[PDB]
Design a protein around this ligand. Structure first.
Ligand SMILES: CC(C)n1c(C(C)(C)O)nc2c(F)cc(-c3nc(N[C@@H]4CCOC[C@H]4O)ncc3Cl)cc21
Lengths: 279, 233
């Protein structure tokens, strides 16, 4: 279709448009990829096509990519436009709008179940979001949670908050599937306190902020390759989750700690977190 | 399985039009598609391509022909472009544009193939991870009661049948699940004729595979007969 723009969703730059035949609103995201001797980059062709493949499953917790077009082409660049069904609000807006005391515990558990159902589906289809945040966790008018802005890492590669980054990516040790689970723990805690759990301006300041709650990991727990040494951080002890996260039942804090585990090999998966007694 | 019901849904969205030669194409005829299809199979066999590249490339060609009129002089360019996108989707080392132009005796140049790539990928709305009969043959084989030794021979013959079917216009009308079931039935029937005490999946395999696809056994039987008549030529 030739979607006519209506407004600007926000910021790279996403616009809102009305589908000329259906009349439904859509979100347009434009990415720039290099135009090589072999034409479209192989990663761009494979990655976007695989995203299109996910639509057959019709998962309720993921955003739907309904149209893709290579609108522009120059000798050095190809512009690809991605058309997604529009979602009225993002988690951050949803959390901010709610009046005091806060979101009900049942509401939090239902949002967490939907978030984890969507995250497991991506995990099952060999996709790791790698940038899970409240802004990219969209919420529909009905309260359905749909994950967005994932699987485009190769094209997006060829400034941002470190609040949800897993300790391995901050330490530059091992990128992995469990990094999203660490972000889920950050989002989970943020639902109770209505504020980001860890706010760090630097990659080392973020780690220091993490160790203030989770404590300082032992030498055995430390990864084989580390950008920053353990001796660079002061000896901090583990702080109870309840002190920094309010109105959370002990089983919820136990689940939170299973997500906020330093070692990604010991960290709870999305499927295991769905089976937790709290959920 | 729930993945099988998503595969059957996905192939309905990647479906070519059975009337594109009459309704869309003004110069391209089936004989031309057969020649370009035969050429694509020869390039895949010579280049030692992944077996799925050729049916995927044909799937892209039928879908593009269903949406865009193409001059008969540009049909080879379209076949080479379909193989190029299919190679990127299914291979660790994709065929280069110049390796495909070599097989046209350098009548087409890489630049032309890269321009076609944008046209093809856009007309298909980047639905490139399309289901191929090979995806269905694997699902049918796990369900079938055969020893791993027999499944490898069934896999070989069925894939040869899928390649033969792709050259003909019957690849356009029958969805990949149908081409796969017809090819598995044609393969097991042939193997059972050669060894009556082996390949015992033959027995009412048309009805069996029609329950998996939820299709009419008569249509699968007609498909199987079409595939076997093609083998004779
Ligand atoms: C905004 C950001 C998360 N975003 C990025 C980047 C690369 C910038 O991260 N790409 C994005 C993209 F492709 C789509 C969306 C998107 N947005 C909406 N609705 C918007 C969401 C925000 O609240 C206001 C609503 O109107 N609906 C559906 C989708 Cl799919 C957001 C994207």
């Amino acid at each position: 279709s030739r979607y006519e723009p209506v407004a600007e969703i926000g910021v790279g730059t996403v616009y809102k448009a009305r589908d000329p035949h259906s009349g439904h609103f859509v979100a347009l995201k434009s990415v720039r990829v290099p135009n090589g001797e072999e034409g479209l980059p192989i990663s761009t062709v494979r990655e976007v096509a695989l995203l299109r493949r996910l639509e057959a499953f019709e998962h309720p917790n993921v955003v739907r990519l309904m149209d893709v077009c290579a609108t522009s082409r120059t000798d050095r660049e190809i512009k690809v436009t991605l058309v997604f069904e529009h979602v009225d609000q993002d988690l951050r807006t949803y959390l901010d709008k709610a009046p005091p005391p806060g979101l009900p515990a049942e509401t939090i558990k239902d949002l967490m179940r939907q978030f984890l159902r969507g995250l497991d589906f991506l995990h099952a289809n060999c996709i790791v979001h790698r940038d899970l945040k409240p802004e990219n966790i969209l919420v529909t008018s009905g309260g359905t949670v749909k994950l967005a802005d994932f699987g485009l890492a190769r094209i997006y590669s060829y400034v941002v908050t470190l609040w949800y980054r897993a300790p391995e990516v901050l330490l530059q040790s091992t990128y992995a599937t469990p990094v999203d689970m660490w972000s889920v723990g950050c989002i989970f805690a943020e639902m109770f306190r209505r504020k980001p759990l860890f706010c760090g301006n630097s990659e080392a300041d973020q780690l220091g902020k993490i160790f203030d709650l989770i404590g300082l990991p032992p030498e055995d727990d430390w990864p084989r390759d580390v950008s920053l040494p353990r001796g660079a951080f002061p000896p901090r002890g583990p702080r109870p989750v309840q002190s920094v996260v309010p109105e959370m039942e002990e089983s919820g804090a136990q689940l939170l700690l299973e997500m906020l585990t330093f070692n990604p090999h010991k960290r709870i998966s999305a499927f295991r977190a769905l089976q937790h007694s709290y959920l | 399985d729930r993945v099988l019901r998503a595969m059957l849904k996905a192939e309905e969205t990647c479906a070519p039009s059975v009337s594109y030669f009459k309704c869309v194409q003004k110069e391209v005829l089936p004989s031309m598609r057969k020649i370009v299809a035969t050429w694509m199979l020869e390039v895949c066999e010579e280049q030692k391509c992944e077996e799925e590249v050729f049916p995927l490339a044909m799937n892209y060609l039928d879908r593009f022909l269903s949406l865009e009129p193409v001059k008969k002089s540009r049909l080879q360019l379209l076949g080479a472009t379909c193989m190029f996108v299919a190679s990127k989707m299914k291979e660790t080392i994709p065929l280069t544009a110049e390796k495909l132009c070599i097989y046209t005796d350098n009548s087409i140049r890489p630049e032309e193939l890269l321009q076609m790539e944008l046209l093809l990928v856009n007309k298909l709305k980047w639905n490139l991870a399309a289901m191929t009969p090979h995806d269905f043959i694997e699902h049918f084989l796990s369900k079938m009661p055969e020893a791993e030794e027999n499944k490898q021979i069934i896999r070989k013959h069925a894939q040869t049948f899928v390649a033969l079917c792709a050259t003909d216009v019957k690849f356009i009308s029958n969805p990949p699940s149908m081409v796969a079931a017809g090819s598995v039935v044609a393969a097991v029937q042939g193997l059972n004729l050669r060894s009556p005490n082996n390949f015992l999946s033959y027995y009412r395999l048309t009805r069996f595979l029609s329950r998996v696809i939820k299709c009419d056994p008569d249509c699968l039987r007609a498909c199987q007969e079409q595939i076997e008549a093609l083998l004779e030529s």
